[PDB]
Amino acid sequence: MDSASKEETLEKLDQEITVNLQKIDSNLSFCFHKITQDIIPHVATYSEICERIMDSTEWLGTMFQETGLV
Amino acid sequence: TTDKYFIEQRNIVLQEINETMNSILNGLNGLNISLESSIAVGREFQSVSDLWKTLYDGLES
Amino acid sequence: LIKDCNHDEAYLLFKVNPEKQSVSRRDGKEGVFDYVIKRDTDMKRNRRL
Amino acid sequence: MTDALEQSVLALEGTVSVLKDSVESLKCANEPSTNLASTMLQTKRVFRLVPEYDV
Amino acid sequence: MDSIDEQIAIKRKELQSLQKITSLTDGLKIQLTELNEQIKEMGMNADSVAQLMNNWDSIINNISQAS
Amino acid sequence: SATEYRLSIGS
Amino acid sequence: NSSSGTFKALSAVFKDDPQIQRLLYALENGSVLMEEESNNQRRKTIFVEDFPTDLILKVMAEVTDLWPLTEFKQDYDQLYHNYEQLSSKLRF
Amino acid sequence: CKSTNSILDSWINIHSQAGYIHKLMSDQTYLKLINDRLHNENVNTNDEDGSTLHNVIALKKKEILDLRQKLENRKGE
Amino acid sequence: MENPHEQVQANILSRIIGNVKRLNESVAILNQELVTINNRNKNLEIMGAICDNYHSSVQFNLEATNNKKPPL
Amino acid sequence: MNANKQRQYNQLAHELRELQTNLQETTKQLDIMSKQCNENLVGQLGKVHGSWLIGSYIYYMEQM
Amino acid sequence: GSLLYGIMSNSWCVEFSQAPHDIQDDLIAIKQLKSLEDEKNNLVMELSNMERG
């Protein structure tokens, strides 16, 4: 094909490897941001909501426990 | 009885303090992670800036 | 058993918190409301322990 | 070196496929709960009970 | 200097593997977004259930006031 | 000398 | 401890400034037995009128804030208008 | 005893209403229908006729008539 | 002297390793959280089970004796 | 092949395998969480309690 | 009676936007539609059976 262009192609491979590494880094950082800032806080919110659930119905729980010895 | 009430108020305010400090520590930890990511990606710029110091630096010369 | 209040009198006498939909005296004096709700919440938290 | 790279490719493919399965199952399980909760379980508190004694 | 085509082949295989990893990471990102949305939806349903169930505490407080 | 994600919780 | 909930709430929501608290105590029993700031320390009674008119107006404005019923609000509006008319004209 | 009978009668009434509502809400199609009914009143509150149970029944009957017409046509085929 | 891209790839890979370690720690913390929530909520399915059983029982009783009255 | 990049890629593979195991655990926990939420929170507790509340509401509204 | 009065008082102060009004027609329509889905299932697998054969 060409010799100058074959060295050019080696340099092409180098450039593509660099840019692909940059894209991978960006994607993984986005995943980390999504996990830390969004998923875990929503899990904590669900935890608080479920705790409020089990708190609000405790009168039923204590009734059922008093007669069922559960 | 008064001493007991004093103690339980202490525990209440202390536990809310604990959770608030938890929030503060988590926020600072996330900020520090982001900042160190910035530094890690930025450190390479020092070499290219040093290379371009040869063209124009101003006060140094 | 249940009589509707004059909205003017209720609003002037009672501070209303729509965020939590709570009712309190404007002067902040504790009534049966504060006692009942505080006792309920304290039972909830002691149960949390 | 290819061993490590294909190992990473296999691992991340496994992660992506497992997340596909989990997301699909979660959506399927959430559709009925959303159906029920969004429509019938809606509750609006228009009033608060007030003893006239405090009034 | 070392054989050019050897370096070329190594770089080509690295490049194809890297592109595969990039696409797979993009897929992982999309999956994480979808998972977060599903967690949001189920948390919304749970909070609706909580709004429904607060009526029991309201009833107990009403009876205590009326007593 | 690199901070690590450590979500604190409870006491 | 024997003060009614009105003055208790007013004092609690007011700052711990000795001036305002002594004004409230004097309003509760006519005059304040305040402790003399001079080196010859002693207790002396000070009447409500000795307190500045602005502080009394602020106290009654707070009272109308906590009891905003229409008669009280209109009375405060009239009295504050009389304030800014008569006493403020006198102030210029 | 009469008072207790009346109290348990009211208990039975509320439990019967609860059972009926539980049966009604157990149907997935009914909940989905309420869902798109809500979304339609968001789109247009006026067009109640667009989403009514009787209109759904009429459309279903028209569909059944079409199905039996196709069945007899295929029998003729 | 030396291939310029070598150091670039070295630093990029190092940062990738670091943030992947961050990802592993984050997902481990998430797993711990989920485990805690499941163990805490292990009372809720009990609650739901007995409630469902009571509902089915009262419906079956309103079937056995015909006190089930027409809907409204 | 550069030995430094060799060790970097080996570390990358190890970390990604750890990530895969952690994600498998996360998937199990999320499946259990979905089971607890849909079947129990709303499926049994929510449905039954809502049914009771609406029934009582209808009873006492018709008794206005 | 205390429990019932509490329930009554709370229900007097809470609005449920999607409570039905004519549960009887809704219910009979649901069972009729269920029978129609059974009929649809019969029709469709008969159709698929003769198409396959």
3-state secondary structure of G45: strand
Please calculate the CA angle D38-D40-D45 and round it to the nearest 5 degrees. Answer: 90
Phi, psi values for residue F4, rounded to 5°: -120, 140
Q: Do chains H and J touch (3 or more CB pairs under 8 A)?
A: yes
First to last CA, chain J: 86
Q: Do C40 and E65 touch (CB under 8 A)?
A: no
Of K29, A35, H12, K17, give the one whose Cα is nearest residue E28: A35
Whether the CB-CB separation of E41 and D30 falls below 8 Å is answered with: yes
Of D34, J36, D24, give the one whose Cα is nearest residue E45: D34
DSSP code, position C21: T
Resolution value, angstrom units: 3.2
Structure tokens at H2: 């009469």
Whether the CB-CB separation of E42 and J34 falls below 8 Å is answered with: yes
Q: Left if phi > 0, otherwise alpha if psi is -120 to 50, otherwise beta: which for F8?
A: beta
Of I17, E7, E17, give the one whose Cα is nearest residue D4: E17
Name the closest residue on chain E to residue A53, using Cα atoms: E50
Phi, psi values for residue C15, rounded to 5°: -75, 130
State the pairing for strand pair C22-25/C14-17: antiparallel
In 10 A of CB K21, how many CB atoms? 8
Rounded Cα distance between J45 and J37, Å, is: 10
Which ranges of chain I does DSSP label H, i.e. alpha helix? 4-41, 44-64
Rounded Cα distance between A23 and E21, Å, is: 10
Of C27, C24, C8, give the one whose Cα is nearest residue C16: C24
Give the distance from CA A51 to its chain's centroid. 23
Give every CB contact of residue A29 below 8 A, 6+ residues apart in sequence.
B37, I19
Using the structure block, give the residue that is written with the tokens 């930890």: B29
Handedness of CA J15, J16, J21, J23 (dihedral sign): positive
Q: Do B36 and F5 touch (CB under 8 A)?
A: no
Instruction: Give CA torsion, residues D35, D37, D42, D43, to 10 deg.
Output: 170
Handedness of CA J24, J30, J34, J35 (dihedral sign): positive
Give every CB contact of residue I6 below 8 A, 6+ residues apart in sequence.
J2, J4, J5
Give the distance from CA B15 to its chain's centroid. 23
Contacts of I55 in chain A (CB under 8 A): none
Please calculate the CA angle E53-E58-E63 and round it to the nearest 5 degrees. Answer: 135
The β-bridge partners of C14 are C25
Amino acid present at E24: L
Name the closest residue on chain E to residue J27, using Cα atoms: E35
Radius of gyration for chain I, computed over Cα atoms and rounded to the nearest angstrom: 30
Which ranges of chain H does DSSP label H, i.e. alpha helix? 2-26, 28-43, 53-76
Exposure string for I36-64, b = 16+ CB within 10 A, e = fewer:
ebeeebebbbebbebbbeebeebbeebee
Q: Do J51 and H14 touch (CB under 8 A)?
A: no
Task: Please name the helix (run of DSSP H) or strand (run of DSSP E) that holds residue G43, with its range, or none.
Answer: strand G43-47
Q: Do F5 and I25 touch (CB under 8 A)?
A: yes
CA distance H75 to chain K (A): 12
Structure tokens at C49: 């322990």
Phi, psi values for residue J63, rounded to 5°: -95, 30
Rounded Cα distance between G19 and G42, Å, is: 17
3-state secondary structure of C23: strand
C-alpha distances in Å from residue G37, one per residue of E64, G17, G21, G40, H39: 53, 15, 16, 8, 74
Q: Do chains E and H touch (3 or more CB pairs under 8 A)?
A: no
Whether the CB-CB separation of E49 and A53 falls below 8 Å is answered with: yes
Amino acid present at D1: M
Mutation site, B22, B44, B45, interface I, largest I CB count within 10 A: B44
Give the distance from CA J31 to its chain's centroid. 5
3-state secondary structure of K15: strand
Q: Do chains J and D touch (3 or more CB pairs under 8 A)?
A: yes
Using the structure block, give the residue that is written with the tokens 């490719």: D9
